Amino acid sequence: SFVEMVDNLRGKSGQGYYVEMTVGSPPQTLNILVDTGSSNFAVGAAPHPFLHRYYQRQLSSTYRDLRKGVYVPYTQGKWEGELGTDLVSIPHGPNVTVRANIAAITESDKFFINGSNWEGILGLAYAEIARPDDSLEPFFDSLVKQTHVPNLFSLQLCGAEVLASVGGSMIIGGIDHSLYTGSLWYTPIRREWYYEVIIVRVEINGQDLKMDCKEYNYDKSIVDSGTTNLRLPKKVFEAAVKSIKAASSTEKFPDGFWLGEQLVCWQAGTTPWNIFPVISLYLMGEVTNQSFRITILPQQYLRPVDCYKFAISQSSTGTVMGAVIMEGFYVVFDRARKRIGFAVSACHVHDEFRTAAVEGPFVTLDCGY
Ligand SMILES: CCn1cc([C@]2(c3cccc(-c4cncnc4)c3)N=C(N)N(C)C2=O)cn1
């Protein structure tokens, strides 16, 4: 049924991708953020200025209360709510219904986004980082256990007066070959909590940043559909921008732009893409001394707002390969074989001079924290 899953994601630029889901009986429709960077199925369950609809447990005849609260403070914001289980389906995903854990958010701070058009989050990472603890089975774990859907899903994020709308596909239970060209290269999932991986080398315009590879994964590297930007450890970030500033020297910008909080504009197809360099991330291969590179264009790391924001930013929590990396590629979260596959996406955005690429192997003769 993969055909019926194609284009089942939507979103606004910089505000995440969501898939339609129903919870409860009768089905309550909600748009839910696909988030490989968290592990809770958490849905607005009380009025909020940014929510135009929300999950109403009392309207559901199949809701069961777990009589347990959950409080999820985090760096940027916070949500808090009540644990229960209910029946869940994805209308444009696998044709099944599962009983899953649901965090019904009763209060939250800076969690929902104005105009994003989603009402909850589908944390697709592992139990290890779930709240309140790893005993709360994540949605995908329940789905696999209760149905026969293979332990694998794949994301094809396609990107783009009003924020640009983005489209994409979440294929659960398999690999849709029409979604990518060329070969799928796999990098090991180093540990099952976040989707943690290892970056062994990075180049800006073919030039090695030449760092001890531990800096690339300090203190970890993760694949996160719930983060817009490519986020880099401080020391790598600074080296990245310096290298990027040099490659686009002709024509200058204010460091408010480089700090990713200040847009820059051209007008109608005048954008000097060729000025900015490609960025290659080399991920560890399944074979010890091998790696492969994913190369991403400026079209990915300059996010549209013809105005663009610099979608590479600093991190104190390690490297985050967010949406702007994923948008060049078809990304397979092969949980069954503890690996993540990358292929050129059938939908990636590129000129007649450059193209996002996935290429290997590269042999590199210790990179993890
Ligand atoms: C554990 C608390 N939590 C944080 C998240 C978030 C989260 C929460 C709310 C909104 C968004 C978000 C996603 N796309 C674009 N704009 C915002 C992300 N998911 C990820 N991966 N990141 C880094 C988060 O901040 C989920 N739960």
CSV table of C-alpha atoms and ligand atoms in Angstrom, one decimal:
chain,number,residue,atom,x,y,z
A,1,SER,CA,0.0,0.0,0.0
A,2,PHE,CA,3.1,2.3,-0.3
A,3,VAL,CA,1.5,4.2,-3.1
A,4,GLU,CA,-1.2,5.4,-0.7
A,5,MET,CA,1.5,6.7,1.7
A,6,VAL,CA,3.1,9.0,-0.8
A,7,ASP,CA,2.8,12.7,0.0
A,8,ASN,CA,1.2,11.9,3.4
A,9,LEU,CA,3.2,14.7,5.0
A,10,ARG,CA,2.7,18.5,5.0
A,11,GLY,CA,4.1,21.5,6.8
A,12,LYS,CA,5.1,25.1,6.8
A,13,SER,CA,8.8,25.9,6.3
A,14,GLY,CA,10.7,25.8,9.5
A,15,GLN,CA,7.7,24.6,11.5
A,16,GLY,CA,8.1,20.8,11.0
A,17,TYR,CA,6.4,18.1,8.9
A,18,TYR,CA,3.2,16.5,10.1
A,19,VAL,CA,1.1,13.5,9.1
A,20,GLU,CA,-2.6,13.2,9.7
A,21,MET,CA,-3.7,10.7,12.4
A,22,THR,CA,-6.9,9.9,14.3
A,23,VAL,CA,-7.1,9.1,17.9
A,24,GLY,CA,-10.1,7.7,19.8
A,25,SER,CA,-13.5,6.3,18.9
A,26,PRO,CA,-15.0,7.9,16.9
A,27,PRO,CA,-11.8,8.9,15.2
A,28,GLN,CA,-10.6,12.4,16.2
A,29,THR,CA,-8.5,13.9,13.4
A,30,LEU,CA,-5.2,15.6,14.4
A,31,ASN,CA,-2.1,16.7,12.5
A,32,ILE,CA,0.9,15.3,14.2
A,33,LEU,CA,4.6,16.3,13.9
A,34,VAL,CA,6.8,13.5,12.7
A,35,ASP,CA,9.7,13.8,15.2
A,36,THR,CA,12.6,11.3,15.0
A,37,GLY,CA,14.2,13.4,17.8
A,38,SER,CA,11.8,12.5,20.7
A,39,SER,CA,9.9,9.4,21.9
A,40,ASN,CA,6.5,10.5,23.2
A,41,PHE,CA,3.2,10.4,21.4
A,42,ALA,CA,2.0,13.7,22.9
A,43,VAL,CA,-1.1,15.6,21.7
A,44,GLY,CA,-2.7,18.9,22.8
A,45,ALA,CA,-5.6,17.8,25.0
A,46,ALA,CA,-6.8,21.2,26.3
A,47,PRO,CA,-7.4,24.6,24.8
A,48,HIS,CA,-4.3,26.6,23.8
A,49,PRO,CA,-4.1,29.9,21.9
A,50,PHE,CA,-2.2,28.2,19.1
A,51,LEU,CA,-4.4,25.1,19.0
A,52,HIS,CA,-7.5,25.2,16.9
A,53,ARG,CA,-8.4,21.6,17.7
A,54,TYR,CA,-7.3,19.1,20.3
A,55,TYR,CA,-7.8,15.5,21.6
A,56,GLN,CA,-10.8,15.2,23.9
A,57,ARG,CA,-10.5,12.1,25.9
A,58,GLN,CA,-14.2,12.2,27.1
A,59,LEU,CA,-15.4,12.0,23.5
A,60,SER,CA,-13.6,8.7,23.1
A,61,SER,CA,-15.2,5.5,24.1
A,62,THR,CA,-12.0,3.6,23.8
A,63,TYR,CA,-9.8,6.0,26.0
A,64,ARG,CA,-8.3,4.4,29.1
A,65,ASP,CA,-6.7,6.5,31.8
A,66,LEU,CA,-3.3,5.4,33.1
A,67,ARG,CA,-3.7,7.6,36.2
A,68,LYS,CA,-0.3,9.0,35.9
A,69,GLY,CA,1.0,12.5,35.2
A,70,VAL,CA,4.1,13.4,33.1
A,71,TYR,CA,6.1,16.6,33.2
A,72,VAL,CA,8.4,17.4,30.3
A,73,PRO,CA,10.5,20.5,30.9
A,74,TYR,CA,13.2,21.0,28.3
A,75,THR,CA,15.8,23.7,27.3
A,76,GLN,CA,13.6,25.8,25.1
A,77,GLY,CA,10.1,25.1,26.5
A,78,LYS,CA,7.9,22.6,28.4
A,79,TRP,CA,4.8,20.5,28.2
A,80,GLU,CA,2.9,18.6,30.9
A,81,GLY,CA,-0.1,16.3,30.9
A,82,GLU,CA,-1.8,13.0,31.6
A,83,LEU,CA,-1.0,9.5,30.5
A,84,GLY,CA,-3.6,7.2,28.9
A,85,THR,CA,-3.9,4.8,26.0
A,86,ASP,CA,-6.3,5.0,23.0
A,87,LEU,CA,-6.8,3.6,19.5
A,88,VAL,CA,-4.6,5.3,16.9
A,89,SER,CA,-4.6,5.2,13.1
A,90,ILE,CA,-2.8,6.9,10.4
A,91,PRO,CA,-5.3,7.4,7.5
A,92,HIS,CA,-2.6,7.6,4.9
A,93,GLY,CA,-0.2,5.1,6.4
A,94,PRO,CA,-0.4,1.4,7.2
A,95,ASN,CA,-4.0,0.2,7.2
A,96,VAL,CA,-4.1,-0.8,10.9
A,97,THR,CA,-5.2,0.5,14.2
A,98,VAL,CA,-3.1,0.2,17.4
A,99,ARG,CA,-3.7,0.9,21.0
A,100,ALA,CA,-0.9,3.3,21.9
A,101,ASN,CA,0.3,5.4,24.8
A,102,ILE,CA,-0.8,9.0,24.6
A,103,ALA,CA,0.3,12.0,26.6
A,104,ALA,CA,-2.6,14.4,26.7
A,105,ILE,CA,-1.0,17.8,27.0
A,106,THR,CA,-3.0,19.9,29.5
A,107,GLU,CA,-0.4,22.7,29.9
A,108,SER,CA,2.6,23.8,27.9
A,109,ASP,CA,4.9,26.7,27.4
A,110,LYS,CA,6.5,27.6,24.1
A,111,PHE,CA,5.8,24.1,22.8
A,112,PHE,CA,3.1,24.7,20.2
A,113,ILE,CA,3.8,27.0,17.3
A,114,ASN,CA,1.5,29.7,15.9
A,115,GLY,CA,0.2,28.6,12.5
A,116,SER,CA,2.2,25.3,12.2
A,117,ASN,CA,-1.1,23.5,11.7
A,118,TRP,CA,-0.2,20.5,14.0
A,119,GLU,CA,-1.7,19.6,17.3
A,120,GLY,CA,0.7,17.0,18.7
A,121,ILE,CA,3.9,15.1,18.3
A,122,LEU,CA,4.8,11.6,17.2
A,123,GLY,CA,8.1,10.9,18.8
A,124,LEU,CA,9.7,8.1,16.7
A,125,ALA,CA,12.9,7.7,18.7
A,126,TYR,CA,13.4,5.0,21.2
A,127,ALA,CA,12.0,4.2,24.7
A,128,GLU,CA,15.3,5.2,26.3
A,129,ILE,CA,14.5,8.9,26.0
A,130,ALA,CA,10.7,8.7,26.6
A,131,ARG,CA,9.1,10.5,29.5
A,132,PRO,CA,8.6,9.9,32.3
A,133,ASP,CA,10.9,6.9,31.7
A,134,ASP,CA,11.8,4.1,29.3
A,135,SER,CA,8.8,2.0,30.5
A,136,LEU,CA,6.4,4.1,28.5
A,137,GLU,CA,6.3,2.2,25.2
A,138,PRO,CA,6.7,4.6,22.2
A,139,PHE,CA,4.2,4.6,19.4
A,140,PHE,CA,6.3,2.8,16.8
A,141,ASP,CA,7.2,0.1,19.3
A,142,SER,CA,3.5,-0.5,19.9
A,143,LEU,CA,2.7,-0.5,16.2
A,144,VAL,CA,5.2,-3.2,15.4
A,145,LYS,CA,4.3,-5.3,18.4
A,146,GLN,CA,0.6,-5.2,17.7
A,147,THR,CA,0.6,-5.5,13.9
A,148,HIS,CA,2.8,-7.3,11.4
A,149,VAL,CA,4.4,-4.0,10.0
A,150,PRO,CA,8.1,-4.6,9.7
A,151,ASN,CA,10.3,-2.7,12.1
A,152,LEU,CA,11.4,0.1,9.7
A,153,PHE,CA,10.1,3.4,8.4
A,154,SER,CA,11.4,6.0,5.9
A,155,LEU,CA,11.1,9.7,5.5
A,156,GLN,CA,11.2,11.6,2.3
A,157,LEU,CA,11.1,15.3,3.2
A,158,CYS,CA,10.8,17.5,0.1
A,159,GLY,CA,10.7,21.0,1.5
A,160,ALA,CA,9.2,23.8,-0.5
A,161,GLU,CA,3.1,36.6,2.2
A,162,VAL,CA,2.6,33.2,3.9
A,163,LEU,CA,5.3,30.7,5.0
A,164,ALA,CA,6.1,28.3,2.1
A,165,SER,CA,4.3,25.0,2.5
A,166,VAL,CA,6.4,21.8,2.3
A,167,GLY,CA,5.4,18.2,1.4
A,168,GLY,CA,6.9,14.8,1.9
A,169,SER,CA,6.2,11.1,2.6
A,170,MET,CA,6.4,8.8,5.6
A,171,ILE,CA,6.5,5.2,4.5
A,172,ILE,CA,6.0,2.8,7.3
A,173,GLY,CA,7.1,-0.8,7.1
A,174,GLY,CA,9.2,-0.7,4.0
A,175,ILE,CA,11.2,1.0,1.3
A,176,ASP,CA,9.5,2.7,-1.6
A,177,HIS,CA,11.9,2.5,-4.5
A,178,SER,CA,10.2,5.2,-6.5
A,179,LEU,CA,11.2,7.6,-3.7
A,180,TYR,CA,14.9,7.6,-4.5
A,181,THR,CA,17.5,7.1,-7.2
A,182,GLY,CA,20.9,5.4,-7.1
A,183,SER,CA,22.0,3.4,-4.0
A,184,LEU,CA,21.0,3.4,-0.4
A,185,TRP,CA,24.1,3.7,1.9
A,186,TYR,CA,23.6,2.7,5.5
A,187,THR,CA,25.2,4.1,8.6
A,188,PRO,CA,24.9,2.3,11.9
A,189,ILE,CA,22.6,3.5,14.6
A,190,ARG,CA,25.3,3.8,17.4
A,191,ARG,CA,22.8,3.6,20.1
A,192,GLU,CA,19.0,3.2,20.4
A,193,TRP,CA,17.8,6.3,22.2
A,194,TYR,CA,18.0,9.2,19.7
A,195,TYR,CA,18.8,8.0,16.2
A,196,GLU,CA,22.4,8.4,17.0
A,197,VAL,CA,25.0,8.2,14.3
A,198,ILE,CA,28.7,8.9,13.7
A,199,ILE,CA,30.2,11.5,11.4
A,200,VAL,CA,33.8,10.7,10.4
A,201,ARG,CA,34.6,13.7,8.2
A,202,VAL,CA,33.1,16.9,6.8
A,203,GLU,CA,34.1,19.0,3.8
A,204,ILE,CA,32.9,22.4,2.7
A,205,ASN,CA,33.5,22.6,-1.1
A,206,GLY,CA,35.7,19.5,-1.1
A,207,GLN,CA,37.9,21.0,1.7
A,208,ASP,CA,38.4,18.9,4.8
A,209,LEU,CA,37.6,20.8,8.0
A,210,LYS,CA,40.5,18.6,9.2
A,211,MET,CA,39.3,18.1,12.8
A,212,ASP,CA,39.6,15.1,15.1
A,213,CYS,CA,36.4,13.3,14.2
A,214,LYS,CA,35.3,13.2,17.8
A,215,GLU,CA,34.5,16.9,17.4
A,216,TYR,CA,31.9,16.0,14.8
A,217,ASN,CA,30.1,13.9,17.4
A,218,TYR,CA,30.6,15.9,20.5
A,219,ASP,CA,28.8,14.9,22.5
A,220,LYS,CA,26.7,13.0,19.9
A,221,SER,CA,25.2,13.2,16.4
A,222,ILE,CA,21.6,12.5,15.7
A,223,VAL,CA,19.2,12.4,12.8
A,224,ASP,CA,16.3,14.7,13.8
A,225,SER,CA,13.2,15.4,11.7
A,226,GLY,CA,12.0,17.6,14.6
A,227,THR,CA,14.9,20.1,14.1
A,228,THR,CA,14.9,22.4,11.1
A,229,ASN,CA,18.5,23.3,11.0
A,230,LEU,CA,21.8,21.5,10.6
A,231,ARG,CA,23.1,22.1,14.1
A,232,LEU,CA,26.9,21.8,14.8
A,233,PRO,CA,29.1,21.7,17.9
A,234,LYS,CA,30.5,25.1,18.6
A,235,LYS,CA,34.0,24.5,17.3
A,236,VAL,CA,32.8,22.7,14.2
A,237,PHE,CA,30.2,25.4,13.6
A,238,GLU,CA,32.7,28.3,13.7
A,239,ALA,CA,35.0,26.4,11.3
A,240,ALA,CA,32.0,25.7,9.0
A,241,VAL,CA,30.9,29.3,8.7
A,242,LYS,CA,34.4,30.6,8.3
A,243,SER,CA,34.9,28.2,5.5
A,244,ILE,CA,31.5,29.2,4.0
A,245,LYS,CA,32.2,32.9,4.4
A,246,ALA,CA,35.4,32.4,2.4
A,247,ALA,CA,33.7,30.5,-0.4
A,248,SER,CA,31.0,33.2,-0.9
A,249,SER,CA,33.4,36.2,-0.1
A,250,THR,CA,32.3,38.0,-3.3
A,251,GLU,CA,29.3,39.8,-1.9
A,252,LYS,CA,29.1,40.2,1.9
A,253,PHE,CA,26.4,39.7,4.5
A,254,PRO,CA,25.9,40.9,8.1
A,255,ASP,CA,26.8,38.5,10.9
A,256,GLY,CA,23.2,38.6,11.9
A,257,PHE,CA,22.7,36.5,8.9
A,258,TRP,CA,25.5,34.1,9.8
A,259,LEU,CA,23.9,33.8,13.2
A,260,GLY,CA,20.8,32.5,11.5
A,261,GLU,CA,18.5,35.1,12.9
A,262,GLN,CA,18.6,37.5,10.1
A,263,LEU,CA,17.2,36.9,6.6
A,264,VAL,CA,18.8,38.1,3.3
A,265,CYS,CA,17.0,38.7,0.1
A,266,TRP,CA,17.4,38.8,-3.7
A,267,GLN,CA,14.5,39.3,-6.1
A,268,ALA,CA,13.1,36.6,-8.3
A,269,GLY,CA,15.5,33.9,-9.4
A,270,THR,CA,18.6,36.2,-9.0
A,271,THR,CA,19.8,34.1,-6.0
A,272,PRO,CA,23.5,33.4,-6.5
A,273,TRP,CA,23.5,29.7,-5.5
A,274,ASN,CA,26.8,29.1,-7.2
A,275,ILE,CA,28.4,31.5,-4.8
A,276,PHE,CA,27.8,29.2,-1.8
A,277,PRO,CA,29.7,25.8,-1.4
A,278,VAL,CA,28.3,22.3,-1.0
A,279,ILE,CA,28.7,20.6,2.4
A,280,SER,CA,29.6,16.9,2.6
A,281,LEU,CA,28.9,14.9,5.8
A,282,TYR,CA,30.8,11.6,5.8
A,283,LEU,CA,28.9,9.1,7.9
A,284,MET,CA,30.5,5.8,9.2
A,285,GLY,CA,29.6,2.9,7.0
A,286,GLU,CA,28.5,-0.6,8.1
A,287,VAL,CA,32.0,-1.7,7.4
A,288,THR,CA,34.5,-0.4,10.1
A,289,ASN,CA,36.9,1.6,8.0
A,290,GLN,CA,34.3,2.8,5.4
A,291,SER,CA,32.2,5.8,5.2
A,292,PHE,CA,30.0,7.5,2.6
A,293,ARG,CA,29.1,11.1,2.1
A,294,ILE,CA,25.9,13.0,1.8
A,295,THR,CA,26.4,16.2,0.0
A,296,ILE,CA,23.9,19.0,0.5
A,297,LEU,CA,23.4,22.1,-1.6
A,298,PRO,CA,23.0,25.7,-0.6
A,299,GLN,CA,19.3,25.2,-1.6
A,300,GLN,CA,19.0,23.1,1.5
A,301,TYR,CA,21.0,25.2,4.0
A,302,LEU,CA,19.5,28.5,2.9
A,303,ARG,CA,15.9,28.2,4.0
A,304,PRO,CA,13.2,30.3,2.2
A,305,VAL,CA,11.3,32.9,4.2
A,306,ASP,CA,13.3,35.7,-2.5
A,307,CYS,CA,14.5,35.8,1.2
A,308,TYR,CA,16.5,33.1,3.0
A,309,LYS,CA,17.8,32.4,6.5
A,310,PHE,CA,21.0,30.6,7.2
A,311,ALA,CA,19.8,27.1,8.4
A,312,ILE,CA,23.1,26.1,10.1
A,313,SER,CA,23.5,27.0,13.7
A,314,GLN,CA,25.5,26.2,16.8
A,315,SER,CA,24.8,23.4,19.2
A,316,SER,CA,25.8,22.7,22.8
A,317,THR,CA,24.2,19.3,22.5
A,318,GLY,CA,26.1,17.8,19.6
A,319,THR,CA,25.4,17.6,15.8
A,320,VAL,CA,21.8,17.6,14.7
A,321,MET,CA,21.1,16.6,11.1
A,322,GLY,CA,17.6,18.2,11.0
A,323,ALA,CA,15.2,18.7,8.1
A,324,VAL,CA,17.5,20.7,5.9
A,325,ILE,CA,19.9,17.8,5.7
A,326,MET,CA,17.1,15.3,5.4
A,327,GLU,CA,15.4,17.2,2.5
A,328,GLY,CA,18.1,16.2,0.0
A,329,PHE,CA,17.5,12.5,0.7
A,330,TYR,CA,15.3,9.5,1.2
A,331,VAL,CA,16.2,8.4,4.7
A,332,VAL,CA,15.5,4.9,5.9
A,333,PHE,CA,15.2,4.3,9.6
A,334,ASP,CA,15.9,0.6,9.5
A,335,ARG,CA,15.4,-0.1,13.2
A,336,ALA,CA,15.3,-3.8,12.5
A,337,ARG,CA,18.9,-3.8,11.4
A,338,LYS,CA,19.9,-0.8,13.6
A,339,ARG,CA,20.9,1.4,10.7
A,340,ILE,CA,19.9,4.5,8.7
A,341,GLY,CA,20.0,4.5,4.9
A,342,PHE,CA,20.5,7.5,2.7
A,343,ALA,CA,19.7,7.8,-0.9
A,344,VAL,CA,19.2,10.8,-3.3
A,345,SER,CA,15.6,11.8,-3.0
A,346,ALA,CA,13.4,11.7,-6.1
A,347,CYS,CA,12.1,15.2,-5.0
A,348,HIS,CA,15.3,17.0,-4.0
A,349,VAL,CA,15.7,20.6,-5.2
A,350,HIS,CA,18.8,21.4,-7.4
A,351,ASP,CA,20.1,23.4,-10.3
A,352,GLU,CA,21.6,22.2,-13.6
A,353,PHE,CA,25.1,22.5,-12.1
A,354,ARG,CA,24.9,20.7,-8.7
A,355,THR,CA,23.0,18.0,-7.0
A,356,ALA,CA,22.6,16.4,-3.6
A,357,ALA,CA,24.5,13.2,-3.7
A,358,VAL,CA,25.1,10.0,-1.7
A,359,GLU,CA,28.3,8.4,-2.6
A,360,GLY,CA,30.6,5.7,-1.3
A,361,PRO,CA,32.6,4.0,-0.2
A,362,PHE,CA,35.4,6.2,1.2
A,363,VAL,CA,38.0,4.4,3.3
A,364,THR,CA,39.4,6.1,6.3
A,365,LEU,CA,42.3,3.8,7.1
A,366,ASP,CA,37.3,6.2,17.4
A,367,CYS,CA,34.9,9.0,16.4
A,368,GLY,CA,32.2,8.5,19.1
A,369,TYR,CA,32.1,10.2,22.5
B,1,LIG,C1,11.5,16.5,25.1
B,1,LIG,C2,10.7,17.7,24.7
B,1,LIG,N1,10.6,17.8,23.3
B,1,LIG,C3,11.3,18.6,22.4
B,1,LIG,C4,10.8,18.3,21.2
B,1,LIG,C5,11.3,18.8,19.9
B,1,LIG,C6,10.2,19.8,19.4
B,1,LIG,C7,9.1,20.3,20.1
B,1,LIG,C8,8.2,21.2,19.6
B,1,LIG,C9,8.4,21.7,18.3
B,1,LIG,C10,9.4,21.3,17.5
B,1,LIG,C11,9.7,21.8,16.2
B,1,LIG,C12,9.9,21.0,15.1
B,1,LIG,N2,10.1,21.4,13.8
B,1,LIG,C13,10.1,22.8,13.6
B,1,LIG,N3,9.9,23.7,14.6
B,1,LIG,C14,9.7,23.1,15.9
B,1,LIG,C15,10.3,20.4,18.1
B,1,LIG,N4,11.6,17.7,19.0
B,1,LIG,C16,12.8,17.9,18.5
B,1,LIG,N5,13.4,16.9,17.9
B,1,LIG,N6,13.4,19.0,19.1
B,1,LIG,C17,14.8,19.4,18.9
B,1,LIG,C18,12.6,19.6,20.0
B,1,LIG,O1,12.9,20.5,20.7
B,1,LIG,C19,9.8,17.3,21.4
B,1,LIG,N7,9.7,17.0,22.7
